Amino acid sequence: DLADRFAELERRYDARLGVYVPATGTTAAIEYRADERFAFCSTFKAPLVAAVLHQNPLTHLDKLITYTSDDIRSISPVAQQHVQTGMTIGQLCDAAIRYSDGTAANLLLADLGGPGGGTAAFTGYLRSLGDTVSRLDAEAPELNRDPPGDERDTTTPHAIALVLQQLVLGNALPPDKRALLTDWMARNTTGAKRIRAGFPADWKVIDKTGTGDYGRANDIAVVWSPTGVPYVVAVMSDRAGGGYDAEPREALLAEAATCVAGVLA
Template sequence: MTIRRTGPADRAARARRRVALSLLMTALGACVSSAQPTVSRTPPLAQRNTVIVPRTATPAARPVANPPTRIPDYDPRSTPSPALLSIIQSLGRGFNGQVGIAVRRVDADWTVAWNGTALFPQQSVSKLWVAMTLLDAVDRGKLSLSDSVTVRRDDMTLFHQPLASLIGRDGYSTTLSSLMNRAMTQSDNTANDVVLRKVGGPEAVRSFLARRFVGNVRFGPGERLLQSATAGLSWNQSYAQGRNFYTARANLPRSLREKALDTYLANPPDGAAPSAVVMALAKLKRGEMLSPASTQLLLATMAQAKTGPQRIKGGVPAGWTYMHKTGTGQDLPPRSTGYNDIGIMTAPDGTSYAVAVFIGSTTEPIPKRWELMQSVARAVAENHDRR
């Protein structure tokens, strides 16, 4: 055992160390007493894994231990995709011509549109309303699709009418079902006009639209009167034969034709608002326009349409379906009028969108019009939310 003895020098050193330690403790005590207390709380797990994204801001990217559960910016059944809205407005704004575009999700309560409430000439799009009026009459027991009809030469109209080649000296016997199919899938003008007369004429169609609360959709006087007035002519039944209408139209002074066309475009008697059309299409798809059987028949017929394969249909992606009706008006070069397509796009998951593109007047070539319509279809598909 070793005993260490301390002298005066050691005792003095220890005293100095005690004084220094006492001063240090006093300083630390002063720092702690002047600071605000800090409370650390660990948030619940659900809060730590949730990133709330405000609509008007984009959160900065940061590494996280677990992927966040993102709260959606919108509910697709009550609010359209902001990207879809932006694209539709950009397409409408950028097109050289008078254009109206509307998109409506069938199971939702919103419509995205450009010039959605303006009236655009429908042309053969209006055949859809004739078909609905016929099927409504069938639903009410007023007519039957199997009713026989004889189409005669005096029933012929003008422009596209493939049925004319079947009309012999004694006429052509067929059924209302066949005529509706020709009108909807081939856009046969004579077939449509015969159906129109059978259902009670333009007033019957207007009455049907009113009973179904379809506003901002006009129905014109029928193909003959509509087209002859648009050209600046008064209807003559001889125009239905051969090239007679084209010859009579070509013989008119250009100033008269321009005035007649301007008058038609300014206030089209067959005008329709794109937003109103997609609303009606959505109601049709939901079964609110016709009976279930008639609804299915009309939608199936629209799916068989042979017209306009490069319009909206040309932009519908694989796996989607499209049922539709086109319309095409008269040209007075360099202007083309009434270049339209309306229909229902359905995604692989069963979600449907009513779509309408109306080109009232443009000098753009047909491929440019196709490009616009196909871009609308692609925008719908690319911004489809499966929720």
């Protein structure tokens, strides 16, 4: 039984685990704590890039964005290396997804614009996709630090899975913008020990991870069977019991994904 397996993993990792896989042709939705709130962490960058793409002509990707020393306030493996030169919107989208670059995402929020440095427009974008649950209230680094239980900067496995489904498999974006988002997630560098670790090599996996305080570790993916049948997989976790400095545990997400893959095979 899946729910028993997910509950075992919670005990093993002293964690709270949430899982959602939306229903398909012949598979029932998989759900475990799927309607409980968990912090977005960096997972918001997938819908953020979709918002920026949707909002502008495709050649907005070529616009140069400049920023300064004081814009670097979070883990930013790419943007730290380009303060002098600036970075194009395309480069920022690439870094935000593939390296989970925090400065890149902050700049993309500012590009999207409006109150809260773009957090309100980001949240409005989710509303336009029928997501009445998720909310973004702060940018990096603040968005990863909300106390366990606090609703700021949260989504649910259920809400984010339905959003990702529309973005990658549905018609939220035109085909050209959709392919840009899909390709970036396909080329993600941060995801190898999460959902990817739970599916066999002949399944395609694209994803966006998030990590935060209180042992937060998330991964949202779209996967395709060896015959091209797609499934959306959202896994979210925290370890409130270890306090603010609780270590995130990727292995928990790998094991949860392995369990899901077992059902979907």
